[PDB]
């Protein structure tokens with residue numbers, strides 16, 4: 299692979315290291331990801347290849363899939379910053395509401411597109427939401443989870459974050475639905491608003507109990523079928539639900555109403571991306587430009 303000159307290490311992903319690189323022939327600047335192997339599953343090659351056709355303005359474009367020497371490389375369009383860094387850089391003053399709303403609106407458009415094509419992300423987090431100088435925000439790594447799997451540690455034994463995982467996944471449900479992505483985005487929306495993670499669990503049970511402490515321990519009334527989930531235990535403590543006004547102050551009622559629908563326990567009652575786009579919170583949406591210092 300001498301068709302690319304590594305410019306720097308953009309980081310270490312869940313599957314492999316990611317590099318910023320320039321195509322020696324085209325001059326194009328791209329993001330190159332080396333994927334974890336002994337023969338490379340043929341099942342994963344066809345799945346990944348299908349994603350090359352999943353193109354939308356709010357989805358990071360997958361340019362090419364290169365298979366070789368027990369090694370798989372994914373070539374993606376390059377963006378200069380991620381939302382995790384932007385939030386840290388905006389920690390003192392906070393991201394202005396108009397920009398938070400623009401970003402949430404664009405992310406829901408991207409989810410609506412992928413979900414209409416039967417593609418789920420499964421591991422949304424600030425680190426895989428990328429931004430540019432024009433005020434655009436895009437989702438990175440859609441569909442890779444299903445193509446492969448989701449280990450506990452990265453290739454460098456790094457600890458995978460559980461902060462954005464939906465309760466049905468934590469309770470052992472075997473079949474994920476588009477609803478898991480809406481839950482993760484709701485958690486990110488709350489974090490942009492308050493400037494602190496909503497549910498920063500440091501273990502699977504701590505993550506689950508942090509959710510229960512805030513939204514109340516779920517029961518058959520609010521979540522039909524919950525007591526029959528694979529990892530549900532009758533011994534779970536029973537915490538009362540807290541008021542949203544206390545969860546994401548000082549967000550207005552339009553915002554709290556939308557957030558509450560994105561965080562419904564029952565995956566079937568949780569709002570869809572398409573329906574969320576029509577919520578009154580977006581009546582005055584615009585597209586501001588962020589101040590990025592690259």
Ligand SMILES: NC(=O)c1ccccc1NCc1cccnc1
Nearest residue numbers: 316329374375376377378379380
């Ligand atoms: N597609 C990409 O461009 C990308 C891929 C993986 C991780 C971060 C990424 N960009 C944002 C970024 C963050 C830090 C430094 N330079 C770029």
